[PDB]
Design a protein around this ligand. Sequence first.
Ligand SMILES: [Mg+2]
Ligand SMILES: [Mg+2]
Ligand SMILES: [Mg+2]
Ligand SMILES: [Mg+2]
Lengths: 231, 231, 11, 11
Amino acid sequence: AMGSMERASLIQKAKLAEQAERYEDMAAFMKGAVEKGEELSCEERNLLSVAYKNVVGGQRAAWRVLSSIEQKSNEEKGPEVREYREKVETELQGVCDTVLGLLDSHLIKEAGDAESRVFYLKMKGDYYRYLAEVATGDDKKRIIDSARSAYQEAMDISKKEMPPTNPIRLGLALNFSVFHYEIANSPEEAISLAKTTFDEAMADLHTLSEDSYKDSTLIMQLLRDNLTLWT
Amino acid sequence: AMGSMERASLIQKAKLAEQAERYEDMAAFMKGAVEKGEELSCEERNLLSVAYKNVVGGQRAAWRVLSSIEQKSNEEKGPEVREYREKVETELQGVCDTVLGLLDSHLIKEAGDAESRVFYLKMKGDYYRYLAEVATGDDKKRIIDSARSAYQEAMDISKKEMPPTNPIRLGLALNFSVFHYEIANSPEEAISLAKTTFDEAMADLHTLSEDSYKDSTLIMQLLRDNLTLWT
Amino acid sequence: RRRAHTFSHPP
Amino acid sequence: RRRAHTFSHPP
Ligand SMILES: [Mg+2]
Ligand SMILES: [Mg+2]
Ligand SMILES: [Mg+2]
Ligand SMILES: [Mg+2]
Protein backbone atom coordinates (compact mmCIF):
# COMPACT_ATOMS: atom_id res chain seq x y z
CA ALA A 1 0.00 0.00 0.00
CA MET A 2 2.69 2.47 1.06
CA GLY A 3 4.62 1.00 -1.87
CA SER A 4 1.81 1.25 -4.41
CA MET A 5 0.80 4.73 -3.22
CA GLU A 6 4.46 5.68 -3.57
CA ARG A 7 4.49 4.41 -7.16
CA ALA A 8 1.37 6.32 -8.22
CA SER A 9 2.70 9.53 -6.66
CA LEU A 10 6.00 9.21 -8.54
CA ILE A 11 4.06 8.70 -11.79
CA GLN A 12 1.95 11.78 -11.07
CA LYS A 13 5.03 13.89 -10.35
CA ALA A 14 6.58 12.70 -13.62
CA LYS A 15 3.50 14.00 -15.43
CA LEU A 16 3.77 17.32 -13.58
CA ALA A 17 7.47 17.59 -14.44
CA GLU A 18 6.60 17.02 -18.11
CA GLN A 19 4.21 19.98 -18.01
CA ALA A 20 6.87 22.11 -16.31
CA GLU A 21 9.55 21.01 -18.83
CA ARG A 22 11.55 19.67 -15.87
CA TYR A 23 12.90 16.68 -17.75
CA GLU A 24 15.72 15.69 -15.39
CA ASP A 25 13.17 15.64 -12.57
CA MET A 26 10.80 13.68 -14.81
CA ALA A 27 13.48 11.08 -15.52
CA ALA A 28 14.25 10.77 -11.79
CA PHE A 29 10.56 10.25 -10.99
CA MET A 30 10.16 7.63 -13.73
CA LYS A 31 13.30 5.76 -12.68
CA GLY A 32 11.87 5.55 -9.18
CA ALA A 33 8.56 4.25 -10.48
CA VAL A 34 10.26 1.61 -12.65
CA GLU A 35 12.14 0.14 -9.69
CA LYS A 36 8.80 -0.48 -7.96
CA GLY A 37 8.71 -3.54 -10.25
CA GLU A 38 5.28 -2.99 -11.81
CA GLU A 39 4.88 -3.09 -15.58
CA LEU A 40 4.61 0.33 -17.22
CA SER A 41 1.48 1.16 -19.18
CA CYS A 42 1.63 2.56 -22.71
CA GLU A 43 1.31 6.07 -21.27
CA GLU A 44 4.01 5.42 -18.68
CA ARG A 45 6.41 3.96 -21.24
CA ASN A 46 6.07 7.23 -23.17
CA LEU A 47 6.74 9.24 -20.00
CA LEU A 48 9.94 7.26 -19.46
CA SER A 49 11.02 7.74 -23.07
CA VAL A 50 10.15 11.45 -23.21
CA ALA A 51 12.07 12.12 -20.00
CA TYR A 52 15.29 10.38 -21.00
CA LYS A 53 15.13 11.39 -24.65
CA ASN A 54 15.11 15.04 -23.59
CA VAL A 55 17.95 14.54 -21.09
CA VAL A 56 20.23 12.56 -23.39
CA GLY A 57 19.14 14.71 -26.33
CA GLY A 58 20.58 17.81 -24.69
CA GLN A 59 23.79 15.97 -23.88
CA ARG A 60 24.12 14.68 -27.43
CA ALA A 61 23.56 18.17 -28.85
CA ALA A 62 26.20 19.56 -26.50
CA TRP A 63 28.65 16.76 -27.31
CA ARG A 64 28.34 17.41 -31.05
CA VAL A 65 28.92 21.13 -30.54
CA LEU A 66 31.97 20.58 -28.33
CA SER A 67 33.33 17.73 -30.47
CA SER A 68 33.10 20.01 -33.52
CA ILE A 69 34.96 22.85 -31.80
CA GLU A 70 37.54 20.34 -30.53
CA GLN A 71 38.16 18.96 -34.03
CA LYS A 72 38.43 22.52 -35.37
CA SER A 73 41.05 23.34 -32.74
CA ASN A 74 42.90 20.11 -33.62
CA GLU A 75 43.03 20.93 -37.33
CA GLU A 76 46.47 22.03 -38.65
CA LYS A 77 46.01 25.49 -28.05
CA GLY A 78 44.37 25.31 -24.63
CA PRO A 79 43.07 22.07 -23.12
CA GLU A 80 39.67 23.53 -22.30
CA VAL A 81 37.51 22.17 -25.11
CA ARG A 82 38.97 18.68 -24.77
CA GLU A 83 38.56 18.73 -20.99
CA TYR A 84 34.94 19.89 -21.18
CA ARG A 85 33.97 17.58 -24.07
CA GLU A 86 35.37 14.67 -22.06
CA LYS A 87 33.23 15.71 -19.09
CA VAL A 88 30.02 15.90 -21.11
CA GLU A 89 30.91 12.58 -22.74
CA THR A 90 31.33 10.82 -19.40
CA GLU A 91 28.03 12.29 -18.22
CA LEU A 92 26.27 11.11 -21.40
CA GLN A 93 27.70 7.62 -20.94
CA GLY A 94 26.39 7.63 -17.37
CA VAL A 95 22.84 8.47 -18.41
CA CYS A 96 22.92 5.84 -21.15
CA ASP A 97 24.28 3.30 -18.66
CA THR A 98 21.40 4.17 -16.33
CA VAL A 99 18.71 3.68 -18.97
CA LEU A 100 20.32 0.44 -20.14
CA GLY A 101 20.47 -0.78 -16.55
CA LEU A 102 16.78 -0.05 -16.05
CA LEU A 103 15.93 -1.86 -19.29
CA ASP A 104 17.91 -4.98 -18.37
CA SER A 105 17.03 -5.10 -14.68
CA HIS A 106 13.35 -4.22 -14.77
CA LEU A 107 11.75 -3.71 -18.18
CA ILE A 108 12.92 -6.25 -20.78
CA LYS A 109 11.09 -9.57 -20.39
CA GLU A 110 10.24 -12.48 -22.64
CA ALA A 111 6.69 -12.44 -21.29
CA GLY A 112 5.11 -9.17 -22.37
CA ASP A 113 2.84 -8.20 -25.22
CA ALA A 114 4.62 -7.51 -28.50
CA GLU A 115 4.29 -3.72 -28.37
CA SER A 116 6.00 -3.42 -24.99
CA ARG A 117 8.69 -5.99 -25.85
CA VAL A 118 9.54 -4.18 -29.08
CA PHE A 119 9.38 -0.78 -27.37
CA TYR A 120 12.01 -1.68 -24.78
CA LEU A 121 14.32 -3.58 -27.14
CA LYS A 122 14.16 -0.63 -29.54
CA MET A 123 15.09 1.65 -26.63
CA LYS A 124 18.00 -0.68 -25.80
CA GLY A 125 19.25 -0.37 -29.37
CA ASP A 126 18.79 3.40 -29.30
CA TYR A 127 20.84 3.96 -26.17
CA TYR A 128 23.61 1.62 -27.26
CA ARG A 129 23.58 3.65 -30.46
CA TYR A 130 24.04 6.87 -28.48
CA LEU A 131 26.97 5.24 -26.67
CA ALA A 132 28.37 4.22 -30.06
CA GLU A 133 28.21 7.82 -31.29
CA VAL A 134 30.88 8.83 -28.75
CA ALA A 135 32.95 5.60 -28.59
CA THR A 136 36.04 5.11 -30.71
CA GLY A 137 37.90 1.81 -30.89
CA ASP A 138 37.20 -1.81 -30.13
CA ASP A 139 34.88 -0.39 -27.51
CA LYS A 140 32.87 1.12 -30.35
CA LYS A 141 32.88 -2.18 -32.25
CA ARG A 142 31.49 -4.02 -29.22
CA ILE A 143 28.86 -1.35 -28.54
CA ILE A 144 27.83 -1.59 -32.20
CA ASP A 145 27.38 -5.35 -31.83
CA SER A 146 25.19 -4.76 -28.77
CA ALA A 147 22.95 -2.23 -30.54
CA ARG A 148 22.52 -4.46 -33.60
CA SER A 149 21.60 -7.38 -31.36
CA ALA A 150 18.90 -5.39 -29.54
CA TYR A 151 17.53 -3.86 -32.75
CA GLN A 152 17.47 -7.22 -34.53
CA GLU A 153 15.67 -8.95 -31.67
CA ALA A 154 13.05 -6.19 -31.73
CA MET A 155 12.81 -6.49 -35.52
CA ASP A 156 12.19 -10.25 -35.26
CA ILE A 157 9.28 -9.71 -32.86
CA SER A 158 7.78 -6.84 -34.87
CA LYS A 159 7.82 -8.80 -38.13
CA LYS A 160 6.21 -11.82 -36.44
CA GLU A 161 3.59 -10.06 -34.32
CA MET A 162 2.81 -6.59 -35.73
CA PRO A 163 1.39 -5.37 -39.07
CA PRO A 164 3.79 -3.43 -41.33
CA THR A 165 2.04 -0.11 -40.53
CA ASN A 166 2.34 -0.44 -36.75
CA PRO A 167 3.94 2.82 -35.51
CA ILE A 168 6.30 1.10 -33.07
CA ARG A 169 7.47 -1.24 -35.83
CA LEU A 170 7.93 1.70 -38.20
CA GLY A 171 9.94 3.72 -35.68
CA LEU A 172 12.15 0.72 -34.95
CA ALA A 173 12.87 0.25 -38.66
CA LEU A 174 13.59 3.97 -39.05
CA ASN A 175 16.14 3.96 -36.24
CA PHE A 176 17.73 0.63 -37.17
CA SER A 177 18.20 1.97 -40.72
CA VAL A 178 19.89 5.10 -39.35
CA PHE A 179 22.11 2.80 -37.29
CA HIS A 180 23.13 1.01 -40.49
CA TYR A 181 23.87 4.27 -42.31
CA GLU A 182 25.52 6.47 -39.67
CA ILE A 183 26.93 3.94 -37.17
CA ALA A 184 27.63 0.58 -38.85
CA ASN A 185 28.80 2.15 -42.13
CA SER A 186 26.38 -0.07 -44.08
CA PRO A 187 24.62 2.44 -46.37
CA GLU A 188 23.18 -0.13 -48.80
CA GLU A 189 21.59 -2.02 -45.90
CA ALA A 190 20.18 1.25 -44.51
CA ILE A 191 18.56 2.14 -47.83
CA SER A 192 17.20 -1.38 -48.32
CA LEU A 193 15.60 -1.49 -44.86
CA ALA A 194 14.08 1.99 -45.17
CA LYS A 195 12.70 1.34 -48.66
CA THR A 196 11.27 -2.07 -47.76
CA THR A 197 9.68 -0.65 -44.61
CA PHE A 198 8.11 2.25 -46.50
CA ASP A 199 6.91 0.08 -49.38
CA GLU A 200 5.37 -2.61 -47.18
CA ALA A 201 3.58 0.03 -45.09
CA MET A 202 2.41 1.87 -48.22
CA ALA A 203 0.74 -1.34 -49.44
CA ASP A 204 -1.36 -1.48 -46.24
CA LEU A 205 -2.24 2.19 -45.70
CA HIS A 206 -5.70 1.69 -47.23
CA THR A 207 -6.63 -0.61 -44.34
CA LEU A 208 -6.17 1.95 -41.57
CA SER A 209 -8.59 4.05 -39.58
CA GLU A 210 -8.10 7.82 -39.64
CA ASP A 211 -6.16 7.93 -36.37
CA SER A 212 -3.92 4.98 -37.32
CA TYR A 213 -3.40 6.54 -40.74
CA LYS A 214 -2.11 9.74 -39.12
CA ASP A 215 0.27 7.88 -36.80
CA SER A 216 1.72 5.69 -39.57
CA THR A 217 2.14 8.31 -42.30
CA LEU A 218 4.02 10.58 -39.89
CA ILE A 219 6.81 8.03 -39.49
CA MET A 220 6.62 7.06 -43.16
CA GLN A 221 7.42 10.68 -44.10
CA LEU A 222 10.55 10.38 -41.95
CA LEU A 223 11.55 7.18 -43.75
CA ARG A 224 10.92 8.88 -47.09
CA ASP A 225 12.97 11.95 -46.17
CA ASN A 226 15.86 9.77 -44.98
CA LEU A 227 15.77 7.87 -48.27
CA THR A 228 15.83 11.19 -50.15
CA LEU A 229 18.80 12.19 -48.01
CA TRP A 230 20.72 8.98 -48.72
CA THR A 231 20.03 8.39 -52.43
CA ALA B 1 49.63 32.70 -12.45
CA MET B 2 47.98 29.38 -11.60
CA GLY B 3 45.15 31.58 -10.32
CA SER B 4 44.92 33.81 -13.38
CA MET B 5 45.27 30.87 -15.79
CA GLU B 6 42.50 29.20 -13.80
CA ARG B 7 40.28 32.26 -14.25
CA ALA B 8 40.77 32.49 -18.02
CA SER B 9 40.07 28.77 -18.43
CA LEU B 10 36.81 29.06 -16.47
CA ILE B 11 35.78 31.99 -18.69
CA GLN B 12 36.58 29.98 -21.81
CA LYS B 13 34.56 27.00 -20.58
CA ALA B 14 31.63 29.32 -19.86
CA LYS B 15 31.75 30.44 -23.49
CA LEU B 16 31.87 26.81 -24.63
CA ALA B 17 28.91 25.93 -22.39
CA GLU B 18 26.95 28.80 -23.94
CA GLN B 19 27.51 27.34 -27.41
CA ALA B 20 26.46 23.90 -26.16
CA GLU B 21 23.36 25.34 -24.41
CA ARG B 22 24.74 23.92 -21.15
CA TYR B 23 23.52 26.81 -19.03
CA GLU B 24 23.85 25.22 -15.59
CA ASP B 25 27.47 24.40 -16.45
CA MET B 26 27.90 27.94 -17.77
CA ALA B 27 26.60 29.41 -14.51
CA ALA B 28 28.95 27.18 -12.50
CA PHE B 29 31.93 28.28 -14.61
CA MET B 30 31.03 31.97 -14.27
CA LYS B 31 30.49 31.70 -10.52
CA GLY B 32 33.97 30.23 -10.23
CA ALA B 33 35.45 33.04 -12.32
CA VAL B 34 33.69 35.73 -10.25
CA GLU B 35 35.19 34.43 -6.99
CA LYS B 36 38.67 34.95 -8.47
CA GLY B 37 38.05 38.58 -7.50
CA GLU B 38 38.81 40.22 -10.85
CA GLU B 39 36.33 42.66 -12.37
CA LEU B 40 34.20 41.21 -15.16
CA SER B 41 34.39 42.77 -18.60
CA CYS B 42 31.28 43.79 -20.53
CA GLU B 43 31.38 40.46 -22.35
CA GLU B 44 31.85 38.52 -19.13
CA ARG B 45 29.01 40.34 -17.38
CA ASN B 46 26.75 39.19 -20.23
CA LEU B 47 28.00 35.61 -19.86
CA LEU B 48 27.10 35.71 -16.16
CA SER B 49 23.67 37.16 -16.89
CA VAL B 50 22.89 34.79 -19.78
CA ALA B 51 23.85 31.77 -17.69
CA TYR B 52 21.75 32.60 -14.65
CA LYS B 53 18.85 34.09 -16.61
CA ASN B 54 18.46 30.77 -18.43
CA VAL B 55 18.73 28.73 -15.21
CA VAL B 56 16.31 30.82 -13.16
CA GLY B 57 14.13 31.34 -16.23
CA GLY B 58 13.46 27.62 -16.47
CA GLN B 59 12.70 27.45 -12.76
CA ARG B 60 10.33 30.41 -12.96
CA ALA B 61 8.51 28.87 -15.93
CA ALA B 62 8.18 25.60 -14.04
CA TRP B 63 7.01 27.34 -10.86
CA ARG B 64 4.27 29.19 -12.75
CA VAL B 65 3.08 25.96 -14.36
CA LEU B 66 3.03 24.07 -11.06
CA SER B 67 1.56 27.00 -9.11
CA SER B 68 -1.25 27.21 -11.67
CA ILE B 69 -2.04 23.49 -11.41
CA GLU B 70 -1.86 23.75 -7.62
CA GLN B 71 -4.34 26.65 -7.53
CA LYS B 72 -6.64 24.74 -9.91
CA SER B 73 -6.56 21.72 -7.59
CA ASN B 74 -7.28 24.03 -4.63
CA GLU B 75 -10.33 25.59 -6.28
CA GLU B 76 -13.72 24.46 -4.88
CA LYS B 77 -6.84 15.75 -3.66
CA GLY B 78 -3.30 14.37 -3.58
CA PRO B 79 -0.36 16.29 -2.09
CA GLU B 80 1.82 15.82 -5.16
CA VAL B 81 1.51 19.19 -6.88
CA ARG B 82 2.00 21.08 -3.63
CA GLU B 83 4.99 18.94 -2.66
CA TYR B 84 6.66 19.37 -6.06
CA ARG B 85 5.89 23.09 -6.37
CA GLU B 86 7.45 23.59 -2.93
CA LYS B 87 10.57 21.74 -4.10
CA VAL B 88 10.97 23.85 -7.24
CA GLU B 89 10.32 26.97 -5.18
CA THR B 90 13.07 26.15 -2.68
CA GLU B 91 15.45 25.43 -5.56
CA LEU B 92 14.58 28.76 -7.22
CA GLN B 93 15.17 30.59 -3.94
CA GLY B 94 18.56 28.88 -3.69
CA VAL B 95 19.68 30.03 -7.13
CA CYS B 96 18.48 33.57 -6.44
CA ASP B 97 20.30 33.52 -3.10
CA THR B 98 23.46 32.42 -4.92
CA VAL B 99 23.32 35.23 -7.48
CA LEU B 100 22.53 37.78 -4.78
CA GLY B 101 25.45 36.50 -2.72
CA LEU B 102 27.81 36.86 -5.68
CA LEU B 103 26.56 40.39 -6.32
CA ASP B 104 27.03 41.50 -2.71
CA SER B 105 30.30 39.68 -2.02
CA HIS B 106 32.17 40.28 -5.26
CA LEU B 107 30.49 42.45 -7.89
CA ILE B 108 28.71 45.48 -6.41
CA LYS B 109 31.17 48.28 -5.63
CA GLU B 110 30.98 52.04 -5.29
CA ALA B 111 34.10 52.36 -7.44
CA GLY B 112 33.21 51.10 -10.91
CA ASP B 113 32.19 52.81 -14.10
CA ALA B 114 28.51 53.68 -14.34
CA GLU B 115 27.58 50.92 -16.78
CA SER B 116 28.90 48.13 -14.56
CA ARG B 117 27.49 49.67 -11.37
CA VAL B 118 24.03 49.99 -12.93
CA PHE B 119 24.28 46.52 -14.48
CA TYR B 120 24.87 44.79 -11.15
CA LEU B 121 22.36 46.85 -9.15
CA LYS B 122 19.76 46.15 -11.83
CA MET B 123 20.58 42.44 -11.51
CA LYS B 124 20.18 42.72 -7.74
CA GLY B 125 16.72 44.22 -8.22
CA ASP B 126 15.84 41.55 -10.78
CA TYR B 127 16.69 38.61 -8.55
CA TYR B 128 14.98 40.09 -5.51
CA ARG B 129 12.01 40.50 -7.83
CA TYR B 130 12.14 36.81 -8.74
CA LEU B 131 12.21 35.98 -5.02
CA ALA B 132 9.22 38.30 -4.54
CA GLU B 133 7.27 36.43 -7.23
CA VAL B 134 7.17 33.32 -5.01
CA ALA B 135 7.08 34.94 -1.53
CA THR B 136 3.83 35.55 0.29
CA GLY B 137 3.64 37.49 3.55
CA ASP B 138 5.78 39.93 5.45
CA ASP B 139 8.64 38.08 3.80
CA LYS B 140 7.30 39.31 0.47
CA LYS B 141 6.98 42.86 1.80
CA ARG B 142 10.62 42.86 2.91
CA ILE B 143 11.83 41.34 -0.36
CA ILE B 144 9.87 44.03 -2.21
CA ASP B 145 11.63 46.72 -0.17
CA SER B 146 14.99 45.17 -1.08
CA ALA B 147 14.23 45.09 -4.82
CA ARG B 148 12.99 48.69 -4.85
CA SER B 149 16.12 49.81 -3.02
CA ALA B 150 18.43 48.13 -5.55
CA TYR B 151 16.43 49.36 -8.55
CA GLN B 152 16.26 52.91 -7.21
CA GLU B 153 19.99 53.06 -6.51
CA ALA B 154 20.63 51.91 -10.08
CA MET B 155 18.12 54.46 -11.36
CA ASP B 156 19.89 57.27 -9.50
CA ILE B 157 23.23 56.39 -11.12
CA SER B 158 21.75 55.95 -14.59
CA LYS B 159 19.98 59.33 -14.51
CA LYS B 160 23.16 61.06 -13.32
CA GLU B 161 25.72 59.35 -15.55
CA MET B 162 24.04 57.89 -18.66
CA PRO B 163 22.07 59.44 -21.56
CA PRO B 164 18.35 58.57 -21.73
CA THR B 165 18.92 56.22 -24.71
CA ASN B 166 21.60 54.12 -23.01
CA PRO B 167 20.48 50.47 -23.36
CA ILE B 168 21.38 49.52 -19.79
CA ARG B 169 19.42 52.51 -18.48
CA LEU B 170 16.47 51.60 -20.70
CA GLY B 171 16.44 47.96 -19.58
CA LEU B 172 16.60 49.03 -15.94
CA ALA B 173 13.62 51.35 -16.40
CA LEU B 174 11.69 48.61 -18.23
CA ASN B 175 12.21 46.12 -15.40
CA PHE B 176 11.64 48.61 -12.58
CA SER B 177 8.34 49.58 -14.25
CA VAL B 178 7.30 45.91 -14.41
CA PHE B 179 8.20 45.67 -10.73
CA HIS B 180 5.84 48.56 -10.01
CA TYR B 181 3.01 47.00 -12.02
CA GLU B 182 3.22 43.28 -11.23
CA ILE B 183 5.01 43.20 -7.85
CA ALA B 184 4.45 46.45 -5.91
CA ASN B 185 0.84 46.86 -7.12
CA SER B 186 1.61 50.44 -8.23
CA PRO B 187 0.20 50.53 -11.77
CA GLU B 188 0.12 54.33 -12.12
CA GLU B 189 3.81 54.50 -11.17
CA ALA B 190 4.62 51.73 -13.66
CA ILE B 191 2.89 53.57 -16.50
CA SER B 192 4.49 56.89 -15.57
CA LEU B 193 8.01 55.43 -15.50
CA ALA B 194 7.58 53.54 -18.77
CA LYS B 195 6.08 56.54 -20.58
CA THR B 196 8.71 58.98 -19.29
CA THR B 197 11.50 56.58 -20.21
CA PHE B 198 10.14 56.07 -23.73
CA ASP B 199 9.46 59.77 -24.29
CA GLU B 200 12.87 60.94 -23.07
CA ALA B 201 14.61 58.33 -25.23
CA MET B 202 12.46 59.22 -28.24
CA ALA B 203 13.61 62.84 -27.96
CA ASP B 204 17.26 61.72 -28.32
CA LEU B 205 17.00 58.98 -30.96
CA HIS B 206 18.13 61.38 -33.70
CA THR B 207 21.55 61.66 -32.03
CA LEU B 208 22.46 57.98 -32.27
CA SER B 209 24.69 56.02 -34.60
CA GLU B 210 23.14 53.13 -36.51
CA ASP B 211 24.31 50.48 -34.04
CA SER B 212 23.21 52.49 -30.98
CA TYR B 213 19.90 53.21 -32.70
CA LYS B 214 19.27 49.47 -33.11
CA ASP B 215 20.12 48.69 -29.49
CA SER B 216 17.94 51.48 -28.07
CA THR B 217 14.85 51.04 -30.25
CA LEU B 218 14.74 47.33 -29.41
CA ILE B 219 14.16 48.06 -25.73
CA MET B 220 11.91 51.02 -26.53
CA GLN B 221 9.58 48.66 -28.43
CA LEU B 222 9.35 46.60 -25.23
CA LEU B 223 8.47 49.70 -23.22
CA ARG B 224 5.86 50.63 -25.83
CA ASP B 225 4.31 47.17 -25.84
CA ASN B 226 4.13 47.12 -22.04
CA LEU B 227 2.40 50.51 -22.10
CA THR B 228 -0.07 49.17 -24.67
CA LEU B 229 -0.64 46.19 -22.37
CA TRP B 230 -1.28 48.36 -19.31
CA THR B 231 -3.37 51.23 -20.72
CA ARG C 1 -3.54 38.24 -19.60
CA ARG C 2 -0.07 38.04 -21.15
CA ARG C 3 2.93 39.03 -19.05
CA ALA C 4 4.84 42.28 -19.49
CA HIS C 5 8.28 42.23 -21.08
CA THR C 6 11.46 42.31 -18.97
CA PHE C 7 14.97 42.64 -20.39
CA SER C 8 18.47 41.65 -19.28
CA HIS C 9 20.47 41.35 -22.53
CA PRO C 10 19.78 41.22 -26.29
CA PRO C 11 18.89 37.85 -27.91
CA ARG D 1 25.14 17.34 -44.45
CA ARG D 2 21.99 17.29 -42.33
CA ARG D 3 21.37 14.34 -40.02
CA ALA D 4 18.86 11.59 -40.71
CA HIS D 5 15.63 11.46 -38.72
CA THR D 6 15.22 9.13 -35.73
CA PHE D 7 11.96 8.59 -33.86
CA SER D 8 10.97 7.53 -30.34
CA HIS D 9 7.49 9.04 -29.81
CA PRO D 10 5.21 11.60 -31.52
CA PRO D 11 5.66 15.32 -30.72
MG1 LIG E 1 19.09 21.24 -22.28
MG1 LIG F 1 35.97 9.71 -22.93
MG1 LIG G 1 15.01 24.15 -18.78
MG1 LIG H 1 8.05 27.56 0.16
